[PDB]
Amino acid sequence: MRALLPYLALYKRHKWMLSLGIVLAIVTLLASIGLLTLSGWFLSASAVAGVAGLYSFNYMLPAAGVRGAAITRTAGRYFERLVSHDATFRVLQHLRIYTFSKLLPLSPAGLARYRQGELLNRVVADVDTLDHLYLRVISPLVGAFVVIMVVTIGLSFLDFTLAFTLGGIMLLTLFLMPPLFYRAGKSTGQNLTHLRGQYRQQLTAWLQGQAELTIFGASDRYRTQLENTEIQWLEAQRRQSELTALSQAIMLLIGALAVILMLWMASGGVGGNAQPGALIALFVFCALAAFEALAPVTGAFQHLGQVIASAVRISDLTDQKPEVTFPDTQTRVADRVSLTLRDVGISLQVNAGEHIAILGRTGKSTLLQQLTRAWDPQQGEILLNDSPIASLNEAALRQTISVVPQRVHLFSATLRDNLLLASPGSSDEALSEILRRVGLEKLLEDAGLNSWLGEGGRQLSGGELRRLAIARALLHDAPLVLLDQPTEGLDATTESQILELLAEMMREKTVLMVTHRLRGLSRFQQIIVMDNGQIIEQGTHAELLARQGRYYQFK
Amino acid sequence: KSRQKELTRWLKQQSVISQRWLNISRLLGFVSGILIIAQAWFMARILQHMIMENIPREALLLPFTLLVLTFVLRAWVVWLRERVGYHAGQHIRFAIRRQVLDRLQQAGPAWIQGKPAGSWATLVLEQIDDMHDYYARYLPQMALAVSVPLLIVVAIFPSNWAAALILLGTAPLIPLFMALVGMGAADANRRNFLALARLSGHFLDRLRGMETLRIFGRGEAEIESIRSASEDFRQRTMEVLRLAFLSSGILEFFTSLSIALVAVYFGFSYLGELDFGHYDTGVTLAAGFLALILAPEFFQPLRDLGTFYHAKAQAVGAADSLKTFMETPLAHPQRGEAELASTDPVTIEAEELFITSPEGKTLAGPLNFTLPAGQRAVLVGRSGSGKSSLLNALSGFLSYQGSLRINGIELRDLSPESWRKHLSWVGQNPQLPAATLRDNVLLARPDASEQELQAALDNAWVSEFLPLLPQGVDTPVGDQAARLSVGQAQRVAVARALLNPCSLLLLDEPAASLDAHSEQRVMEALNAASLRQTTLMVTHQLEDLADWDVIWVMQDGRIIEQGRYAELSVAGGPFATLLAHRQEEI
Numbered sequence A: 001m002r003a004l005l006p007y008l009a010l011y012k013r014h015k016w017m018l019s020l021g022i023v024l025a026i027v028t029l030l031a032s033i034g035l036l037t038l039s040g041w042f043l044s045a046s047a048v049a050g051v052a053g054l055y056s057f058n059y060m061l062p063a064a065g066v067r068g069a070a071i072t073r074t075a076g077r078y079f080e081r082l083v084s085h086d087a088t089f090r091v092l093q094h095l096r097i098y099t100f101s102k103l104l105p106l107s108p109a110g111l112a113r114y115r116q117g118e119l120l121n122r123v124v125a126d127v128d129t130l131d132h133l134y135l136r137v138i139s140p141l142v143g144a145f146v147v148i149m150v151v152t153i154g155l156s157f158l159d160f161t162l163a164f165t166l167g168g169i170m171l172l173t174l175f176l177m178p179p180l181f182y183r184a185g186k187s188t189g190q191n192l193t194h195l196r197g198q199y200r201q202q203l204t205a206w207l208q209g210q211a212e213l214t215i216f217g218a219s220d221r222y223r224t225q226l227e228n229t230e231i232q233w234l235e236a237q238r239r240q241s242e243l244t245a246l247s248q249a250i251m252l253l254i255g256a257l258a259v260i261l262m263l264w265m266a267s268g269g270v271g272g273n274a275q276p277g278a279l280i281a282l283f284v285f286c287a288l289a290a291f292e293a294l295a296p297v298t299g300a301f302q303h304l305g306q307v308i309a310s311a312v313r314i315s316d317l318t319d320q321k322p323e324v325t326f327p328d329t330q331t332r333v334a335d336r337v338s339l340t341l342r343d344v345g346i347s348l349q350v351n352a353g354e355h356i357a358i359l360g361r362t363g364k365s366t367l368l369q370q371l372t373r374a375w376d377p378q379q380g381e382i383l384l385n386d387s388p389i390a391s392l393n394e395a396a397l398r399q400t401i402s403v404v405p406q407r408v409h410l411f412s413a414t415l416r417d418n419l420l421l422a423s424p425g426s427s428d429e430a431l432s433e434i435l436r437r438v439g440l441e442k443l444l445e446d447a448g449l450n451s452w453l454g455e456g457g458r459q460l461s462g463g464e465l466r467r468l469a470i471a472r473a474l475l476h477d478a479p480l481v482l483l484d485q486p487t488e489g490l491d492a493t494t495e496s497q498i499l500e501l502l503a504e505m506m507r508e509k510t511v512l513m514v515t516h517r518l519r520g521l522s523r524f525q526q527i528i529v530m531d532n533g534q535i536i537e538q539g540t541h542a543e544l545l546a547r548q549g550r551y552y553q554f555k
Numbered sequence B: 001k002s003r004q005k006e007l008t009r010w011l012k013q014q015s016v017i018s019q020r021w022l023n024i025s026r027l028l029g030f031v032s033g034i035l036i037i038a039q040a041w042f043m044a045r046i047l048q049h050m051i052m053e054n055i056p057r058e059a060l061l062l063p064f065t066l067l068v069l070t071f072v073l074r075a076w077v078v079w080l081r082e083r084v085g086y087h088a089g090q091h092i093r094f095a096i097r098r099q100v101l102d103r104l105q106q107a108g109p110a111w112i113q114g115k116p117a118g119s120w121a122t123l124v125l126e127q128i129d130d131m132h133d134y135y136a137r138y139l140p141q142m143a144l145a146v147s148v149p150l151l152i153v154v155a156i157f158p159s160n161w162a163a164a165l166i167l168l169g170t171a172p173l174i175p176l177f178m179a180l181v182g183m184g185a186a187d188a189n190r191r192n193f194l195a196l197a198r199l200s201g202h203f204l205d206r207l208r209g210m211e212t213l214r215i216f217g218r219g220e221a222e223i224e225s226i227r228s229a230s231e232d233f234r235q236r237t238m239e240v241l242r243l244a245f246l247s248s249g250i251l252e253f254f255t256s257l258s259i260a261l262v263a264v265y266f267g268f269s270y271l272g273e274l275d276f277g278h279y280d281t282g283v284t285l286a287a288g289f290l291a292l293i294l295a296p297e298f299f300q301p302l303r304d305l306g307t308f309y310h311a312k313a314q315a316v317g318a319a320d321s322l323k324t325f326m327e328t329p330l331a332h333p334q335r336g337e338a339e340l341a342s343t344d345p346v347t348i349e350a351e352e353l354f355i356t357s358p359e360g361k362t363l364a365g366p367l368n369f370t371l372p373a374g375q376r377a378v379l380v381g382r383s384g385s386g387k388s389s390l391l392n393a394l395s396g397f398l399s400y401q402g403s404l405r406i407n408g409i410e411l412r413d414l415s416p417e418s419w420r421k422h423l424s425w426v427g428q429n430p431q432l433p434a435a436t437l438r439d440n441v442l443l444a445r446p447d448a449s450e451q452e453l454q455a456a457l458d459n460a461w462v463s464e465f466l467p468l469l470p471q472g473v474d475t476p477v478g479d480q481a482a483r484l485s486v487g488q489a490q491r492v493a494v495a496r497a498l499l500n501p502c503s504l505l506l507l508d509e510p511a512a513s514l515d516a517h518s519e520q521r522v523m524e525a526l527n528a529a530s531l532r533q534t535t536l537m538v539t540h541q542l543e544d545l546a547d548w549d550v551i552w553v554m555q556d557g558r559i560i561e562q563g564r565y566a567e568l569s570v571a572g573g574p575f576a577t578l579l580a581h582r583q584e585e586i
């Protein structure tokens, strides 16, 4: 319950739209009650007055009341649905901005241990569930409470022992029944998520291992084991529905006990007078209508457990500590940087124009993670342009380094916004000039700069994504460029183009390249071979090839 | 669209298993409308006695007793009806999940591999369980929504026909206006369908690519993209909801108009302002309470049906991907009844195979080869050249139109149950489905002594790292072999291959995706285990193939060269060029 505190504080941004959506939920739900209890009294007063009372009974005030209560119940529900859903989409926006601003400082490192794809599908699902806290928990529970307190206060102007009996019954089942059924269904609700995720692990094992099981003859012995988990899983779901059946049967008997008591207790007398003619039906029709307030109240408290669970997963994930801290020194962006590296325990110095190639023996490269400050090194110091790497703020670090990832991410946006990612300020022609130079010709056809890429649009190929990563790295020009196996799983007819693109496009830059492929290393100054995080030999292609060494065997 | 007509007919066809449960729930929804009428009749009669005739409560103990009794029967047929409805939807999911798993086990590994194992779990878990509320809640409510309202009208008509026309007069009006509104709600849901589908996966896209936003300095400028794409999502889906909350508000308007009109008509007819509606027998108070208690109950069935109408959509979406799956025309490899009793290394001769996927596409073209008993062979080639498709065809997982005669008997005439008794094999990925690491190894022989059990362990060099595990031999094999490494998960696959005598041994790529050390360990075990019987291997490690009897290089599913390794290594053929390819990479 204290888990929801960071997210309930997010509600203060839209406190008037969130409260108005509840105020309308009460006005609607009091007009439902008030329309049926005013009708029930009007029929009783009219019947008692009879034909003789046609001129002494003021029937225009109740008639104008049932018309008002019918209009505000009809239109109160419409605006309650609009205001409560508009405010739910403004909480969702504020939840996503809040949880994206917190997952950025811990982007590569904090989320490393979690396998992604399922972690992020859990993050999107948890943020959505934290959005249901208002419509599905707060609005029904708070609305039910103050509707009971208004019909209990309102009815107390007629009789106290009757208003506190209908109010007592209604308010006792608002506070006791929802928790007592969460406790009863707590055991079978976790015996449900155990037997479901157990069936899922026995199913993918039976499906993935279908070749191994079929040939070793165990595909049927493991099918009945899978079918015995479903049999146990379908008994846990049956036990859960046998508690929802009891919840609804009991709620029908509590609303029955309120009607019976009002029929019996209000027959003796409402207030002072015995034989109260039309006041019996004002109480028995309030008891009949007022249990619509408590209709959504047990599923509101039940769903609250899921919100608290999601409020912990999001909170424990976004309250981690960022591995690296960037100091806001406001250092100006450097130019023609000369990366020097010592005891990181490799040591290697890259001058301000050298095209280093690193031949690691056959995931994401660890040396490039430290250069982009994914995490600080434990052993040595990294210096960009005779200044420590940690001395540069985030804004300047992202501007003196232009890395191509091994995993090129194709954002769902247009082709223009996949290139404006690198340089926001570039004009539209610049994107067209560089999409040609790189060889990305098929993209520019049929108005491609507005074409949708990524999910929901056209997918690029492996050799065509690699040209997009280099397109960003060239638009976001920086003195230091960190290639990460740019030619990997790539066609030989285009691998030469990528390498030739690297040599001519990024000639006046401090290119550092990490690969395991030997093609086109003759144009790379100071080739470095690296094994188990250790530098064996260094030197130009000619120098490293003449002397016997690790480069020679491979060549 | 005829898609919904075909899907909703499929859903109705899958409900025959639970026809008994859907007939009881239809019968219990008709009793519930009888008790609603009875409960409103006793309440109206007690109230009339106390208000009009001024009868004390202690003289009405019989109508109170009968009223308490209907209130208890109503709660009983609601508890009963909630549990009958569950059995309706359970027996349908249990009988469809059995059909999905039967079609998925018969289709074999050839078709299962097409989609990720998490794509199949969505179909078998998420999609099948999405059809529960359609049968448990929506279908029972769709019948209660037409019975109970007609019972209400039939019960009020003898008492008063003007009160029975207020409720009935809105029966044609309610769907006439929802359909009139609904056709305006399909306009806004059509010109926003695409823009709202690109904005839904926008958060996950910006969240799956935070590494690219980090390394370009765009993390802060993709918060103004979340703010803009969430504002646009709201202002575009609130447009749709302004037309979908009107449709729900048509029923609330006619619910409110009917209760107001019942009150005003009865209230005015008691004072003489109105003189129609009754049968000239005088309008009583119990006739106005009966119509007023039952006025909100007329529309309740329709209002509950409006909260279940989503359960028809997610059960048509689920029935969509469950009907395409169940009607794929995929054809299975035919199973003979002959039995191979040689119990010794078998000879594989093959000509004009044309091995085909279950979908009917041809995977390996014209294949012509022979394999004498006990002679190891190796398949080499490029990625996507149909090297593995021959191994699957020899296992029986794929269909071939040609001649694949093993030991003189064609494969398609050989019973699969007995053929796989002489077959052991090691795939690129060691799928371990058993419980414990010892149960993975004992999967081949469910009952064997520890002497040969240990013999098959150390021979595969799995005993090397047993003390490293927390429990040793009986270490609990984690799901997807998470506890083990990929290197250790491979040597345990080798252990069960060696444990059972095999008349043919098929290695897919046992050394691929291995670490430094285990790569020799798996080869040392297998290279010595490939001699005891006929063997066929597939590999990309071309360095040490100087020992294997024949080299079968293939491209686009056609064996090109043959012969010992030395012959085609320097002959300048495809193999020599393919061997030079490995020299480009370190």
Ligand SMILES: Nc1ncnc2c1ncn2[C@@H]1O[C@H](COP(=O)(O)OP(=O)(O)NP(=O)(O)O)[C@@H](O)[C@H]1O
Pocket (backbone or CB within 6 Å): B110, B111, B114, B357, B358, B361, B363, B381, B382, B383, B384, B385, B386, B387, B388, B389, B390
């Ligand atoms: N069940 C299947 N359904 C459809 N296509 C398939 C199926 N099995 C294989 N293919 C395709 O048919 C071709 C045969 O490739 P494959 O049988 O995997 O040979 P391969 O050499 O083992 N590939 P690789 O493992 O990368 O070396 C490829 O293009 C596959 O994608």
Ligand SMILES: [Mg+2]
Pocket (backbone or CB within 6 Å): B387, B388
């Ligand atoms: Mg293969």
